[PDB]
Design a protein around this ligand. Structure first.
Ligand SMILES: Nc1nc2c(ncn2[C@@H]2O[C@@H]3COP(=O)(O)O[C@@H]4[C@H](O)[C@@H](COP(=O)(O)O[C@H]3[C@H]2O)O[C@H]4n2cnc3c(N)ncnc32)c(=O)[nH]1
Ligand SMILES: Nc1nc2c(ncn2[C@@H]2O[C@@H]3COP(=O)(O)O[C@@H]4[C@H](O)[C@@H](COP(=O)(O)O[C@H]3[C@H]2O)O[C@H]4n2cnc3c(N)ncnc32)c(=O)[nH]1
Ligand SMILES: Nc1nc2c(ncn2[C@@H]2O[C@@H]3COP(=O)(O)O[C@@H]4[C@H](O)[C@@H](COP(=O)(O)O[C@H]3[C@H]2O)O[C@H]4n2cnc3c(N)ncnc32)c(=O)[nH]1
Ligand SMILES: Nc1nc2c(ncn2[C@@H]2O[C@@H]3COP(=O)(O)O[C@@H]4[C@H](O)[C@@H](COP(=O)(O)O[C@H]3[C@H]2O)O[C@H]4n2cnc3c(N)ncnc32)c(=O)[nH]1
Ligand SMILES: [Zn+2]
Ligand SMILES: [Zn+2]
Ligand SMILES: [Zn+2]
Ligand SMILES: [Zn+2]
Lengths: 369, 361, 369, 357
């Protein structure tokens, strides 16, 4: 009941020589520098019914060389699973094993889609941890055929100080987007080239994400990704159709012009007029506002095209600034800003919810020429 | 034209780093072995340099191809390609490597939070969370965090009490922030289960948020910390909006059971009741984590509607599973904050709903 | 040639059940939660001369139960050392083995010194990485019997923006020290009690470390540690005698009063009068200014004692602010600030080298009342 | 009065305490060390830390310390000891996990010239690292300086060198790990021209966990003698005068003063040397630290002496050139003008690098 050499070689091959339970590279010893095959081929169901996970109904003979029953493991993970059969049951190991092999198979069968710079931009203005994993962006990239020369750029804004999101805070945000990011992109010019693709995901203040989009909007190969509460960086549903984007035009008059975006949620009119008395409200919405609505990149593009029409319509109404009140997903805030890089050179005054002022909207950044 | 010769050590390295697929068409070159036939490594694949011959083993630059793809590649007399494939080849190896290291993306912090009541009658040992974590690839590397909500002081569960609960949980959560590792230095995931009164669980959600790699687990009366049925579809979440009027706005969540309307109006005279329910309310309804996500999505769609109706507080009367209470609290951690007044039944006052927690302005 | 159970028990004991080469806990499986002894007792010199590191002059019988030859290793580390004898030679393993055992013995014989909050404060104002390892502070704490309930507080200032250390930069520094730090200490109020000991090390802007010192100067049980270019967080020499702190009193006059601290290096008088024309210079120095001079905490105490006298004497000369020009180690910058909380309530205007003005001194923070 | 334990409980408690009394620190394996049988149950007592099970709350005490503890009839303590017990276990744990503080990045930096005559392989740095407890987790970084363009090694060239080195390291320093999430240590060896090595030092600094290694003609990347004391460093102060201030470093060899005044007429020469200048003098890392300490003591004097640049003429080993560069990375910056020998222009010194404002 000994696994033969051919089967052991298949196990090493189908796992790419990494431990299926911890991911460590079993083909090399990085401490001393020698190539060495230090993994072990491990049986889920043992040959003896008295072994760990042993069961009589298992016919050892029939599965000695069955790779569905054989994992590549490091010595430590192998020792643990054999010392704790109840804690590493057959069904759980089999499920992890099949999931591991399937990730390899999908990687091997994905067409090459070129290089991109991974870019994560995140704030600290929430009262919870806010952290996008680098691995998840790289995995979403790979699923689309994109790879990177390095793990990329990850910018975390300084947290608000004791006065909240004050002038200092927004200066820091400006410096992070317009100076820190630019410096880190310059350091990648030699490895990625003059005009590289940018695989960008943000989870940060809405005004900050708009400023980010304005800063990078003139990059022709920007590839927007999205953090999703359920799916993390995985697109929820590549087949989903974008929603209708409904628009209500502003009333006539000379009051300040407000653009209200009700996409993540319905922005209450009372909160807009409280912050901007006399506002003339134009609203872009979807039928069922929802935090979950960024189902794929086509949704993002459909938002962009809907917005492009309405920004033209509003800029034709007035030379004065447009005041923005947005409950929108983070990926849509980036795309909003990218429309302002060149296509829409009007002044936009971005309002945002203010925890220091009982959730009222207050004016934050000015965007535009 | 020519063929590139390699020794056997080089073939084994190349087969391993490519996982035995052709790098140009993706075909799995172990097909013979899968059919029960001998694996003829040297006949079902060709190994060639990714780049044309330069002016000057180097296994990192050798490609694994199927015979068909190899024959389609123009080659010089030494078996080098006439056109560069290094970009495609390096990208192939990077995609394999990223998949192969994916298990270290499961580095995780276990967190169990219970009330004193449930710690006394229904203690959840770390072993129960750890084995459920391990089954879905979440791997703890240090002792799990097991804490109880603090007993209230003389002022009861006032604003300061709840802020102290949040501070205490978030202090423990500094492990999630700081104990970075794996291939990329990512912060570890949080694996969290709660069993406590619904207001306390909402404050646990307030503490953890929903903008990090975080997996909620659920204690189930029959299945403990294992998910009852990973294939179960989430139920429909039904909603009835409130009647129009000036009375206080109440949101009733009838998910574990049907909350009787009279208990709500008794506790909140004049209440205008909106209700979120499922077709068959049940203590057992958290069949998998997708049920929790689906609850969140439906809830937020309706909270958007309710919050727009009035500036005044939403008064919450919830019969919901513990994991759903955590997600409810986590949902309300945006910058935007509407006022929510959470009621909970007092067993020592005839099970009457009493206001227990305020969220927002 | 079979190591007996008594000796295996001693090996497990003297290593505290961790892998001597990677430090992993071999008494417990953290993934599934079962106590398990999954380590291996490993021989440096093998019983057979044909084994890894084997040699003919090794009397295996004589060393079967010789704990100098027996390491506790995890299965992975043990596999590697047996697969690459040239990369893990006998003398190198023996040295690592003995060093590991001595660290355990020293920890076990250290008298208890109570609990303390670990605090690391570091800037990003250098043109190189600046990063104090958490482990090294905890290890210096443990060498003095101090332990903590968590790995502690680590505050990293925001980097200077594109304008250098501007008003925004110093506002961020103030917020990091006066708000961020206080919030982090507040979260620990219950765990550590009311007036806990504070084990603090800084490597940050001199004016910022002085402000840090002022913020913690009224604390009881403040325990300053020091980052040293040779010894990291270890005190260089506990037996070293503190240097004499030489003092040159200021000239009589009506010009602005400057305190020059020449401890790390000699501050050139020319640079002080350039920044503050007509300065009346008082100077505190040591006989041989040196970056390495913080040999132990008694040196910091001696600096405090000297400053007590000299600040009193300068403060009696004028009601006007005192202008500070300091080339001093980071630990002494904290100590200087700590004297301003209650001992010396006078206005101090801190100058610092300005990389945006050709290394000239420019005024930065104002400290004191 | 006595709490009783079986063998398995003893195994656990002895292991988590490393076999010392938690109250006085005495090593309770003394008998075994003397060659006598280990009498676990007689050289120590185990009792709960708290008045009143879980092996985590059982303490190991020597008989004397156990005798001084008031106990109830079941052997539980009357007074709580859990704080001292938990602190003791923490100190043991911190020591036992110290090997994971060795996570490290290998870095080999060479010039094309020295790569041709003396290529340093990663394997050699890794084995020296491993012997010191430094543990790489991925491929080592092996780089060489770019060739200059037509403007030579000017300000822009050296700034691009620094930027490329720091970028290369950034990727690895993000790979935090171990028990506390610390960034890995840098293990660096350089073999290139002295100016390039100083710029390597400028890139890495000296305010992080970083260990320099040294290539030695006899011992390669292994330290010649870990026990060797560092040499004394002999200082010649510069004469008074108006000429340009020169610092001559005669560490590898004695630099002839005439070669300096030829390159820099009128030079006021300060010198730092050792009693026996030698290519072999980097006997251990403490020699490098001692060089930095002596150097900075004198640089403090020289920088205070004049606002003008310090002109550097250095016969120093490669590892010391790196540390020279790293020393000059404070906010404070004095101008240094670095000279180097042009072996094909009759070994004449020529200015090749400026550090400072
Ligand atoms: N419900 C609601 N929200 C309103 C209202 N008026 C303004 N808002 C703001 O809209 C955003 C809605 O949340 P989101 O998750 O759809 O999008 C945010 C936003 O793009 C960015 C910053 O967050 P924040 O400042 O909280 O803005 C929130 C709200 O204040 O990041 C996105 N984001 C936040 N958390 C997450 C997360 N967990 N996952 C993914 N994206 C997130 C109003 O009336 N009602
Ligand atoms: N039947 C019914 N229940 C109502 C009504 N109005 C309010 N409720 C409350 O809803 C919860 C329903 O029980 P659950 O098991 O689905 O969820 C609880 C809850 O999230 C948390 C605290 O429990 P409790 O304070 O009893 O709230 C219970 C009920 O009073 O923990 C969950 N929980 C409690 N025990 C368990 C358990 N053994 N296993 C798993 N989860 C548990 C109303 O009108 N009717
Ligand atoms: N040589 C010299 N230095 C001068 C002069 N005028 C002002 N200075 C400043 O004094 C400090 C001397 O360096 P240090 O290492 O002794 O102390 C620093 C200081 O306490 C803090 C911030 O650094 P910085 O802003 O560079 O101040 C440096 C200098 O500008 O951190 C300490 N620090 C910096 N680097 C390290 C390190 N690697 N290890 C330990 N502590 C460090 C003047 O005329 N001459
Ligand atoms: N004898 C002598 N040398 C002088 C004088 N003035 C300047 N120098 C330069 O000092 C260096 C001394 O050699 P080293 O081996 O001690 O250090 C070199 C140096 O750090 C780096 C580059 O070499 P180079 O440009 O030749 O500088 C040489 C000399 O010109 O690398 C070090 N290095 C070079 N080769 C090796 C090697 N094989 N092993 C180890 N380190 C090496 C003067 O008057 N006299
Ligand atoms: Zn493993
Ligand atoms: Zn093919
Ligand atoms: Zn190990
Ligand atoms: Zn004792």
């Amino acid at each position: 009941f000994n696994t033969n050499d051919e089967t052991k070689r298949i196990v090493w091959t189908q796992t790419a020589g990494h431990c299926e339970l911890c991911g460590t590279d079993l083909t090399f010893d990085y401490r001393a520098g020698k190539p060495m095959k230090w993994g072990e081929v491990a049986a889920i169901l043992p040959a003896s019914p008295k072994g760990p996970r042993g069961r009589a109904d298992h016919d050892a003979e029939a599965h000695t060389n069955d790779t569905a029953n054989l994992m590549l493991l490091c010595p430590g993970c192998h020792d643990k699973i054999d010392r704790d059969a109840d804690g590493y049951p057959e069904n759980d190991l089999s499920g992890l094993h099949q999931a591991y092999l399937e990730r390899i198979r999908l990687a091997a069968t994905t067409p090459d889609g070129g290089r991109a710079i991974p870019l994560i931009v995140q704030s600290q203005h929430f009262q919870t941890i806010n952290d996008i994993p680098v691995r998840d962006l790289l995995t979403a990239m790979s699923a689309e055929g994109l790879t990177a020369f390095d793990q990329g750029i990850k910018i975390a804004f300084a947290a608000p100080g004791p006065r909240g999101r004050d002038t200092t805070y927004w200066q820091n945000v400006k410096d992070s987007v317009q100076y820190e990011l630019e410096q880190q992109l310059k350091r990648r010019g030699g490895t990625y080239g003059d005009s590289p693709a940018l695989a960008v995901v943000g989870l940060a203040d809405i005004p900050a994400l708009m400023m980010l989009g304005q800063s990078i909007g003139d990059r022709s190969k920007r590839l927007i990704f999205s953090f999703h509460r359920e799916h993390l960086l995985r697109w929820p549903d590549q087949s989903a159709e974008p929603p209708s984007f409904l628009f209500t035009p502003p009333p006539n008059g000379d009051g300040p012009l407000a653009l209200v975006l009700s996409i993540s949620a319905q922005v209450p009119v009372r909160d807009v007029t409280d912050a901007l008395p006399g506002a003339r409200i134009a609203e872009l919405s979807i039928p069922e506002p929802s935090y979950a609505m960024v189902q794929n990149r086509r949704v993002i593009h459909a938002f962009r095209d809907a917005l492009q029409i309405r920004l033209s319509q509003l800029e034709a109404l007035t030379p004065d600034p447009i005041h923005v009140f947005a409950a929108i997903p983070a990926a849509l805030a980036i795309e909003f800003g990218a429309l302002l890089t060149t296509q829409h050179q009007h002044t936009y005054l971005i309002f945002d919810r203010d925890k220091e002022n009982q959730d009222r909207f207050t004016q934050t950044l000015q965007l535009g020429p």
